[PDB]
Amino acid sequence: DTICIGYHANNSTDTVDTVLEKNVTVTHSVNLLEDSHNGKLCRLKGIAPLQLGKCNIAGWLLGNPECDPLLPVRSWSYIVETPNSENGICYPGDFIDYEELREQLSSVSSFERFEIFPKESSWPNHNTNGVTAACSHEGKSSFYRNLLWLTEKEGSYPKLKNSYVNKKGKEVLVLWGIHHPPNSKEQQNLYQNENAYVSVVTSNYNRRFTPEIAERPKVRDQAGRMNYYWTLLKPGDTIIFEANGNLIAPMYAFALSRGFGSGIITSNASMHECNTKCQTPLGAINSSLPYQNIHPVTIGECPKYVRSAKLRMVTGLRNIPS
Amino acid sequence: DTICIGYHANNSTDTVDTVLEKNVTVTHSVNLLEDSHNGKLCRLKGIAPLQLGKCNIAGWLLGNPECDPLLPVRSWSYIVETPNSENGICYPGDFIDYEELREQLSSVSSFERFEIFPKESSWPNHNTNGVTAACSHEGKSSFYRNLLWLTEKEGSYPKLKNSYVNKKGKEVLVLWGIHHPPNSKEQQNLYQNENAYVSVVTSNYNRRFTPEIAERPKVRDQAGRMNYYWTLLKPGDTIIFEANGNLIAPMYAFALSRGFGSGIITSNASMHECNTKCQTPLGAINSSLPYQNIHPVTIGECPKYVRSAKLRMVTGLRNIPS
Amino acid sequence: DTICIGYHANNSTDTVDTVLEKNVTVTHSVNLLEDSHNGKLCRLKGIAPLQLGKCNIAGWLLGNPECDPLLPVRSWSYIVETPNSENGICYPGDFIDYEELREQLSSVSSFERFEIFPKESSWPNHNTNGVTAACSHEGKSSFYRNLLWLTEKEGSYPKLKNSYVNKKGKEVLVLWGIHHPPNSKEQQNLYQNENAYVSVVTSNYNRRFTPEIAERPKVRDQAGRMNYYWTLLKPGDTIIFEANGNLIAPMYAFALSRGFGSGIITSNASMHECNTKCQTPLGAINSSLPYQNIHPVTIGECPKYVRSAKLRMVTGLRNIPS
Amino acid sequence: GLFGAIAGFIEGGWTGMIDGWYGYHHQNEQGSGYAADQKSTQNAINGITNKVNTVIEEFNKLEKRMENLNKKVDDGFLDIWTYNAELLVLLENERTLDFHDSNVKNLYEKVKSQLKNNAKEIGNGCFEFYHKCDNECMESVRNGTYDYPKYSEESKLNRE
Amino acid sequence: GLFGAIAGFIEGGWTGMIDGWYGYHHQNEQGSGYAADQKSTQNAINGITNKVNTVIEEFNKLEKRMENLNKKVDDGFLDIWTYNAELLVLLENERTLDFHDSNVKNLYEKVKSQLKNNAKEIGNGCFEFYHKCDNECMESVRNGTYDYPKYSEESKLNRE
Amino acid sequence: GLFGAIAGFIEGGWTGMIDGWYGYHHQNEQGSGYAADQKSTQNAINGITNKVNTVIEEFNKLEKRMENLNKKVDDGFLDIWTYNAELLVLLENERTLDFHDSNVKNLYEKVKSQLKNNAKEIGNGCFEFYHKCDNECMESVRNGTYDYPKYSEESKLNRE
Amino acid sequence: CLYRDPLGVAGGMGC
Amino acid sequence: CLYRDPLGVAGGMGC
Amino acid sequence: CLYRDPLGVAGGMGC
Ligand SMILES: *[C@@H]1O[C@H](CO[C@@H]2O[C@@H](C)[C@@H](O)[C@@H](O)[C@@H]2O)[C@@H](O[C@@H]2O[C@H](CO)[C@@H](O[C@@H]3O[C@H](CO)[C@@H](O)[C@H](O[C@H]4O[C@H](CO)[C@@H](O)[C@H](O)[C@@H]4O)[C@@H]3O)[C@H](O)[C@H]2NC(C)=O)[C@H](O[C@@H]2O[C@@H](C)[C@@H](O)[C@@H](O)[C@@H]2O)[C@H]1NC(C)=O
Ligand SMILES: *[C@@H]1O[C@H](CO[C@@H]2O[C@@H](C)[C@@H](O)[C@@H](O)[C@@H]2O)[C@@H](O[C@@H]2O[C@H](CO)[C@@H](O[C@@H]3O[C@H](CO)[C@@H](O)[C@H](O[C@H]4O[C@H](CO)[C@@H](O)[C@H](O)[C@@H]4O)[C@@H]3O)[C@H](O)[C@H]2NC(C)=O)[C@H](O[C@@H]2O[C@@H](C)[C@@H](O)[C@@H](O)[C@@H]2O)[C@H]1NC(C)=O
Ligand SMILES: *[C@@H]1O[C@H](CO[C@@H]2O[C@@H](C)[C@@H](O)[C@@H](O)[C@@H]2O)[C@@H](O[C@@H]2O[C@H](CO)[C@@H](O[C@@H]3O[C@H](CO)[C@@H](O)[C@H](O[C@H]4O[C@H](CO)[C@@H](O)[C@H](O)[C@@H]4O)[C@@H]3O)[C@H](O)[C@H]2NC(C)=O)[C@H](O[C@@H]2O[C@@H](C)[C@@H](O)[C@@H](O)[C@@H]2O)[C@H]1NC(C)=O
Ligand SMILES: *[C@@H]1O[C@H](CO)[C@@H](O)[C@H](O)[C@H]1NC(C)=O
Ligand SMILES: *[C@@H]1O[C@H](CO)[C@@H](O)[C@H](O)[C@H]1NC(C)=O
Ligand SMILES: *[C@@H]1O[C@H](CO)[C@@H](O)[C@H](O)[C@H]1NC(C)=O
Ligand SMILES: *[C@@H]1O[C@H](CO)[C@@H](O)[C@H](O)[C@H]1NC(C)=O
Ligand SMILES: *[C@@H]1O[C@H](CO)[C@@H](O)[C@H](O)[C@H]1NC(C)=O
Ligand SMILES: *[C@@H]1O[C@H](CO)[C@@H](O)[C@H](O)[C@H]1NC(C)=O
């Protein structure tokens, strides 16, 4: 009669590494690394992302005409640019502190787009119908939906002053532009005053702008330029615009709501009616395991990105069947 | 006759965690985590902190009248602002490169406040008695103790030029202001010259300033503004002020001594006659253990901050009394 | 008859540390820490570094005359400044965005220095022979080799305009200067026009400059100053210079080739005909071990810097000879 | 392995022991078969479960320095977490295999300590009884209640 | 535990052994009592002491990117050091308990190796002598100087 | 040490065993000498080799905040990597010494298990045979092919 | 059908 | 009263 | 002359 002590073996082919030995076959192991994605853009907490498509953040917020389908979207779980996000500033120029503006939008989960200065009541004694072929739409010259090109009327551009008081209970993003014509003749044809100025002031913002006339290498058929500026008007505060030329005035502004856990990613993936807790630019990934090697850029409740190709912990025994 | 081998047990209720098991009762253990503070602000190496109280760094260094009790303090182990640190710039405006100035002060362990430009000998043919209700004291209009409001005298503001040579053997912090009146009438009433300029130059600093007249939303009863500027004048170098208007001139400046291990914290705690090696904004903490979970902001020789609620190492045995 | 089980001992004096015990003598161990250097500057992949010697990056790229031996060097494995790297801006002034320029050069592995604007054909009706004693050479007044001091001719400084189209297939670094004379008399003697301007524009760069006349504390015998500016002209783009005074014009520019693994170090070590995979400012080091304690600044394929004085792993046994 | 049992003096595992991680094979007149030690298997599952749960818990063109600092931060954190993840898994895998080895060794020694000189220790994990050990006897060995005095006389006669 | 002694074949600890971490209980005609093994206790204190000593050694509104980079750095370092602290303590606690287990196991085996077949090994940490073992005999066992030939004949007669 | 053999029941090492890490010393009528156990030595070299291979795989004056953030990043990474390097080496050194201890212990137990009561276990790593064990016999012990039944009768007579 | 294995670190145990 | 325990990793040992 | 030790973690073994 005999009794023997022994241990379990099976047909597992799982392998793990240790410090003393590589590729040990074991009876049971656990993968610790998410290493697949579903190739889709998905909702977070039931909320879809804002897909800018062929537009970038500048084209969206200025209202580049080619971005009209974006205008009514009011809330999103993250912002998606494409490699094709080309429609931005259609009249060439510099977007001042653009990267800071993107950083601000990265924590915005919704906003209200509203008329800060109605077109036909805010700027008496000026023309408000300026368009340009650089911002075309339907093969016709057009302009930013959220700004307004003020020009002389009846050979005169009187000094203007207008103000807006923020009674939204939320920060208001205000954008405007300054036109820099290529030569003095265009300056006088558009704004009459050669030594024009613009002033924009809040309680905690102030800047003066001048025509800065200069002939530039042409971009999109324009020797002149338009610079773009923004500020965040805090609740209760007033913004004041003063000008005798060159102002590309605000028309629509944005009352901002802040949220946690948003961001901006660039992705070639398509939206589907899927749901995830963790989105990457390649696709959605699961969130149960501690690590992932799909992509360093993630949105949501996500595993930690690592470079590892394999992370596998043994739970069972060294497997020695026979 | 018998002999048995065994091990110690006792009445310890200490518990520790391992990888295989949680909450193991052991005969002896050591806490590795400082998890209490004394609720006080304390001295470091016998040196008390500078308590700005109701003032911030701007109010202290400009000499906002409400900060007069701070004027004679010459050395400190760290700088403490309160949630009530409100008295700062009393005449509204922008403090240019303020955050860099705070960063500089974070390594200053003492200074000498001295007269760089005596009031009644430095600015002949100008008035030096300008005050404002925005900087009130004893219910009377007043002004920064370290600056001087130069205005026209007998209907004239002649061009001024003065210089100071740094013979302190140490860097000298020089602060000044530029006044931007709300309208041209105040500009001419105060400084006579409508197209006034200010020039401030050292060997490695140069800046020109202009009136920048503009009507702003009122802050503290002022439609005008005052911007504040600073530079560090290196030993042996000269600073030169030139102006025909708008200069808020330096009167007192600071010869700086640098030290290691200082900093700026915000705290609601009160000073006591206690001594520590490690100060946090909640209170002083001991320094013997490797980790602490009281606060990430520390001054002195301190344990490392961690999020952990418990860090306890077993030294004795698994405790199995019976 | 007997048989015994036992283990190896020898005359090793190697010691290692464990968690329970320090200074354990073992029969064999491995050093994990590179702790010596060869005291030399060496080649990387057969390519020598650029030794700026007594010049800094500014003196090299502007062509300070005292840096003439550097002019023909076209490729390098890293850039070496010395504690004696003094020859830089010889006419005093500010080098705008200098640190960003250094950062750009840190990834340049070669360039082509070429004439962007030939001296005697680019600026008709202006003198091109301006020199200064602040930039002396052979005891004679001289000037930057890569820039050109344009001055009035026959009592006149007509408005100039010239352009360069980048057909290099690579980014072109363009440098220029703006002169700020000490007083209005020198301004008119040199450039005739008191209200002079300079304009520099590319497609993605634009800046206007003015004389900014001001008397400064003298540096290198100069009450005036010269500010230095640069931009990267992308392939296919055009740079345009326009001026009626004060322009220190580009003459030579640099077509840049980018590489990985370069950098800028400061070193007192001398070049030798040696080869390494890892260079530090103290000397070259080997690359076989995982860690090194020679210096945190390294160029090449290098071990990781640590503060440790000893890192030694036991491979053999606790050594108990007897 | 560190404790000498798995891939050691017990050279291989048992595909026939399907119902646990460690256990027994017996042979007597009533037959043969495998039986897991359920107590040691459950205890090991508890420990490995706790171990697994413990493990599973833009810049513009003139801002290149800030861009490179951001990249240094991202790359350095990634280096550290890749290192931490891979090293913890290697170390814990070594410890898990040694834990199983220890569990087998301890079970073997518990049987050896019950049987004393009422069985011969072969050295491959097996014991050959010096007395007839029927199913109740085998179960007493597996359950830690083996009665050495009951069989000592028969065994001493056979051990001779 | 890994070495099978603590909470293993020696099922519980001794509140009566107050003067050390590991040691002995004896019973003979002269009486009974607990005695720490002072050498193994002191050695363990030395090792645990070395282990403990080893363990105990603003932005403005247009600078949000720099503020967030600073926060990323602070948060990432905090994550890493919280992880490092907690993991080192878990790993070292496991190793400390296994160290104590090993120390008990080694002391048990040292006694077993001195006594050989002059005592019967019960399996609970205890040995029952086959000879009378007075206080000097017990002390020789505790001090590693037990004299097996001195008692082998008496023991063989009793073991029979 | 954890497994009790090195600097334990085998008190010291052998400078005379030059040809391996663990092994044997014998004495019989034909003479004496040291011989490494080549299998266990090679296996240990393989493991330690895998372990070693596993281990071996400006700002301007108005930019002080950015300069200090850069320094915080550099200093924090340096602190972390110095800690990681030193701790991994301490932990792995402890494990290496315990690995060698285990290897010696396992070799000792393999010999003990072959010899059974055909030899007397002294307790210092040595066995004294109850039968004459010539060079072929010694080699069979070293190679794991010792034939206990061949010598059991002679040994039982001498053990008496 | 024998063990409490809520994480499934072991297999089905034949049942 | 028995051991050198300068860190006090063990208790008072009854003395 | 006895072992495969490509890293040289052991000594010369007397040969
Ligand atoms: C690998 O082994 C598996 C079993 O091991 C278990 O599972 C693995 C993953 C691991 O956790 C181990 O630790 C576990 O022990 C195989 O899966 C089993 O396959 C068998 C088939 O042989 C299944 O069984 C049958 O179940 C039927 C329904 O209950 C019974 O009717 C049937 O009885 C007949 O056959 C047997 C002989 O097998 C006779 O003795 C009877 O008298 C009667 O004639 C069997 O009992 C069992 O259910 C499976 N278990 C699991 C957990 O899946 C696996 O085999 C593969 O997978 C199964 C599902 C089928 O697809 C097989 O054809 C296939 O080979 C092994 N894999 C490989 C590649 O060999
Ligand atoms: C927990 O146990 C403690 C003892 O264990 C030691 O300390 C702990 C922390 C740990 O390190 C263990 O490893 C150690 O072994 C208790 O503390 C002891 O309490 C006893 C009281 O019973 C104290 O003793 C007395 O000391 C007096 C002065 O020397 C003696 O006169 C007295 O003798 C009389 O009583 C005894 C019976 O106890 C008789 O046999 C005598 O003949 C005589 O009549 C005792 O010897 C001892 O000094 C304490 N040791 C320490 C280190 O403090 C602890 O008990 C608590 O703490 C003590 C201080 C008192 O407040 C107790 O009332 C109290 O219960 C235990 N704690 C709990 C909660 O039970
Ligand atoms: C430390 O020990 C070394 C040997 O241990 C080996 O190497 C070390 C590093 C470690 O890896 C251990 O694990 C290894 O086992 C010494 O090096 C050896 O020295 C001896 C000298 O005694 C050398 O041997 C001689 O070799 C000659 C050529 O083959 C033989 O002719 C000679 O034979 C004569 O001498 C012997 C007595 O030694 C007689 O028995 C013979 O009959 C005959 O008369 C020897 O065999 C051996 O080659 C060396 N091995 C190595 C690997 O270097 C080392 O000694 C030092 O180093 C050597 C090189 C010489 O410089 C010695 O003088 C010197 O002391 C030890 N070091 C110290 C400080 O003691
Ligand atoms: C482990 O297995 C993988 C895949 O089978 C193989 O690529 C690798 O080389 C193996 N490593 C070793 C050390 O055998
Ligand atoms: C996520 O896990 C589920 C199972 O819970 C699986 O079906 C799905 O494919 C996983 N998703 C990805 C992208 O791997
Ligand atoms: C450990 O004990 C604490 C407090 O007694 C309790 O909160 C926790 O749930 C316990 N954990 C386990 C695993 O029992
Ligand atoms: C610091 O330690 C001392 C004992 O050394 C203790 O009395 C004091 O309360 C501790 N301070 C805090 C804040 O815990
Ligand atoms: C270890 O040895 C070094 C050098 O011999 C010595 O400086 C150090 O103090 C020693 N440490 C201990 C704990 O003995
Ligand atoms: C690098 O290693 C070689 C041996 O491979 C050695 O000769 C040389 O001195 C080493 N260099 C330094 C700087 O230590």
Specify the 3-state DSSP secondary structure of C218: coil
CB A268 within 8 A of CB A209: no
| CB proximity A216 to C under 8 Å | yes
C178 and C255, same domain (yes or no): yes
Q: Are D13 and G7 spatial neighbours (Cβ–Cβ below 8 Å)?
A: no
Q: Return d(Cα B286, Cα B282) in angstroms, integer.
A: 13
| Structure token pair of residue A164 | 């807006």
Angle at A270 (CA atoms; ends A266, A275), nearest 5 degrees = 100
- Distance from chain centroid for Cα C185: 37
Q: Which two tokens stand for residue C96?
A: 């705008």
Q: Across the interface, do E2 and D99 touch by the CB < 8 Å criterion?
A: yes
Cα–Cα distance between C174 and C201 in angstroms, integer? 12
N-to-C CA span, chain A:
22
List subunits contacting chain H, requiring 3 or more Cβ pairs under 8 Å.
B, E
DSSP-based three-state secondary structure for D13: coil
Q: Does domain F1-160 bear CATH number 3.20.20.70?
A: no
Amino acid at B269: A
Distance CA C183, CA E105 (A): 94
Angle at B240 between CA B234 and CA B246, to 5 degrees: 125
Closest residue to atom 6 of ligand 9, CA basis: C286
The answer to whether the CB atoms of B214 and A203 lie below 8 A apart is no
Judge: B19–D99 Cβ closer than 8 Å, yes or no.
no
Q: How many domains does chain A have?
A: 2
Asked whether C292 and C305 are in contact (CB, 8 A), the reply is: yes
Q: Kindly state the DSSP code that residue B231 receives in the 8-state scheme.
A: E
Shared-domain flag, residues A102 and A165: yes
User: Cα A36 to chain center, whole Å?
Assistant: 27
Distance, in Å, from the CA atom of A224 to the CA atom of C165, rounded to the nearest integer, reads 20
Closest CA to F100 of F9, F3, F18: F3
Cα separation, D102 vs D40, in Å, equals: 11
Q: Which atom of ligand 1 is nearest to the CA of A27?
A: 13
CB-based contact A139:A27 (threshold 8 Å): no
> A234 and A102, same structural domain?
yes
Distance from CA of F118 to the nearest CA of I (A): 32
- Alpha helices per DSSP H over chain E: 38-55, 64-115, 135-143, 148-159
* CATH code assigned at B9: 2.10.77.10
CA–CA gap between residue D69 and residue D50 (Å, rounded): 39
Kindly give the interhelix angle for D38-55 and D64-115, rounded to the nearest 10 degrees.
170
Closest-lying ligand 7 atom to the alpha carbon of residue B37 = 13
C120 and chain E in contact, CB less than 8 A:
no
Dist CA B83 CA B86 (whole Å): 8
Domain of residue C54 covers 42-272
Residues of F in contact with A21 (CB under 8 A): 47, 50
Residues C167 and C285 in one domain: no
Burial class (CB in 10 A: 0-12, 13-18, 19+), A299: buried
- Residue D85 in tokens: 């993840």
Note whether C37 and C104 are same-domain residues: no
Q: Are A and H touching by the rule of 3+ CB pairs within 8 Å?
A: no
Nearest ligand by distance to the CA of I13: 3
Chain E residues whose CB is inside 8 A of the F130 CB are none
Q: Rounded distance, CA F144 to CA D11, Å?
A: 13
**Under a CB-based contact definition with an 8 Å cutoff, are residues A70 and A200 in contact?**
no
The type of residue at E156 is K
Atom of ligand 3 nearest to the CA of C11: 1
Deposited experimental method: X-ray
Contact C108, C259 (CB under 8 A): yes
Q: Is A283 helix (H, G, I), strand (E, B) or coil?
A: strand
Tokens 């034939």 sit on residue: F147
Q: What is the 3-state secondary structure (H, E, C) of chain F?
A: CCCCCECCCECCCECCCCCCCEEEEEEECCEEEEEECHHHHHHHHHHHHHHHHHHCCCCCCCCHHHHHHHHHHHHHHHHHHHHHHHHHHHHHHHHHHHHHHHHHHHHHHHHHHHHHHHEEECCCCEEEECCCCCHHHHHHHHHCCCCHHHHHHHHHHHHC
Q: Rounded to 10 degrees, what is the CA torsion of B53, B54, B59, B65? A: -110
Domain parsing of chain F, residue ranges: 1-160
Longest dimension (CA), chain B: 119
Whether the CB-CB separation of C199 and C241 falls below 8 Å is answered with yes
Closest CA to B95 of B30, B177, B150: B177
Q: Are residues C81 and C122 located together in one domain of the fold?
A: yes
The distance between the two most distant Cα atoms of chain I, rounded to a whole number of Å, is 17
Q: How much distance in Å is there from the Cα of C35 to the middle of ligand 9?
A: 11
CA atoms within 13 Å, Cβ hemisphere of C25:
12
- For a substitution probing ligand 5, which of A31, A279, A286 has the most ligand atoms within 8 Å of its CB? A286
CB contact residues (below 8 A), chain E span 84-143, against chain F: 84, 88, 91, 95, 98-99, 102, 105-106, 109-110, 113-114, 116
Subunits close to I (at least 3 CB pairs below 8 A): C, F
D23 near D36, Cβ under 8 Å?
Answer: yes
**Angle at the Cα of H7 (from H6 to H12), degrees rounded to 5?**
75
C-alpha F114/C-alpha D124 separation (Å) is 10
- For F112-137, letters b (16+ CB in 10 Å) and e give ebbbeebbbbeeebbbebbbebeeeb
The helix or strand, by DSSP H or E, that contains position E36, with its residue range, turns out to be: strand E31-36
Structure-token match 């070299």, residue found = F45
- CB-ligand 8 contact for C13 (6 Å cutoff): no
As for ligand 4, residues whose beta carbon falls within 6 Å of it are: A 22-23
B125 and B215 housed in the same domain: yes
Cβ–Cβ contacts within 10 Å for residue B51, how many? 20
One domain for residues B29 and B71 = no
Distance CA C232, CA A20 (A): 54
Task: For residues F79 and C305, give the distance between their C-alpha atoms in angstroms, rounded to a whole number.
Answer: 10
Q: Which residue is closest in CA terms to ligand 6's atom 5?
A: B23
Check if I12 has its Cβ closer than 6 Å to any atom of ligand 3: yes
Check whether residue A57 and residue A136 sit in a common domain: yes
Q: Do B296 and E74 touch (CB under 8 A)?
A: yes
Paired with B166 in beta bridges are none
State the Cα–Cα distance between residues D77 and E79, nearest whole angstrom.
10
Joined tokens for residue B16: 């520790």
Domain identity same for A236 and A175: yes
In this complex, how many residue pairs, one in chain A and one in chain G, have their CB atoms less than 8 Å apart?
Answer: 11
Nearest CA in chain E to C22: E50
Interface contact flag, B21 D54, Cβ < 8 Å: no
Considering the domain architecture, whether residues B82 and B8 belong to the same structural domain is answered as: no
The whole-angstrom separation of Cα C106 and Cα C88 is 18
User: Which of C19, C31, C21 shows the shortest CA–CA distance to C311?
Assistant: C31
Q: Helix E64-115 and helix D64-115: axis angle, to 10°?
A: 20
From residue B110, alpha-carbon distances to A191, B94, B264, B298, F81 in Å are: 57, 26, 14, 20, 36
What's the distance, Cα to Cα, between the start and end of chain H in Å?
Answer: 6
I11 lines ligand 3 (CB under 6 A): yes
DSSP alpha helices (H): ranges in chain A?
Answer: 57-62, 98-105, 184-191
With a 6 Å cutoff on the Cβ, whether B11 touches ligand 2 is yes
CA distance B274 to A153: 74
Domain match, A289 and A156 both: no
3-state secondary structure at position B84: coil
At A321, list the tokens: 């069947």
Shortest alpha-carbon distance between residue E103 and chain D (Å) = 15
What is d(CA C162, CA C116) in angstroms, rounded to the nearest whole number? 11
Contact (Cβ atoms closer than 8 angstroms) between residue F111 and residue C3: yes
Let me know: does C316 contact C28? Beta carbons within 8 Å. Answer: yes
CA I3 to chain centre: 5
Which amino acid, residue B134? A
DSSP state at residue A67:
G
Closest ligand 5 atom to residue A38 Cα is: 13
Among F70, E65, E58, smallest CA distance to B104 is for E58
Residue A213 Cα to chain centre, angstroms: 31
Cβ atoms of residues B255 and B234 within 8 Å: no
Q: Are B4 and E108 spatial neighbours (Cβ–Cβ below 8 Å)?
A: no
Q: Is A315 in the pocket of ligand 1 (CB under 6 A)?
A: no
Residue D48 with chain B: CB contacts under 8 Å: 20
The residue whose C-alpha atom lies closest to atom 52 belonging to ligand 2 is: H12
Tokens of B233: 């004048």
Count CB neighbours of B186 within 10 A. Answer: 15
Give the dihedral sign, CA D130/D132/D133/D137.
Answer: negative
CATH of the domain at C93: 3.90.209.20
Q: Ligand 5 centre from A27 Cα, in Å?
A: 23
Instruction: Tell me the CA distances in angstroms from E39 to A210, B89, F98, F149, one per residue in order.
Output: 89, 72, 20, 42
Neighbours of C139 (CB within 10 A): 7
In this structure, which amino acid lies at residue B284?
A
Backbone angles phi, psi at A137, to 5 degrees: -160, 130
Helix (H) or strand (E) holding D138: helix D135-143
Give strand pairing partners of B250.
B147
Q: Residue B160 has which token pair? A: 């001024």
**How does DSSP classify residue E64?**
H
Q: How far apart are CA F62 and CA F70, in angstroms?
A: 14
To test the pocket of ligand 9, the residue of C35, C286, C291, C293 to mutate (highest count of ligand atoms within 8 Å of its CB) is C286
- Which residue from E minimizes the CA distance to A104? E64
A180 and A214 Cβ atoms separated by less than 8 Å: yes
d(CA B69, CA B71): 6
A275, A220, A228: which is closest to A249 by C-alpha?
Answer: A228
Distance from CA of C19 to the nearest CA of E (A): 5
Among residues A234, A229, A202, which one has the least CA distance to residue B214? Answer: A202
- Ligand number nearest CA of G10 is 1
Q: Which atom of ligand 5 is nearest the CA belonging to A285?
A: 13
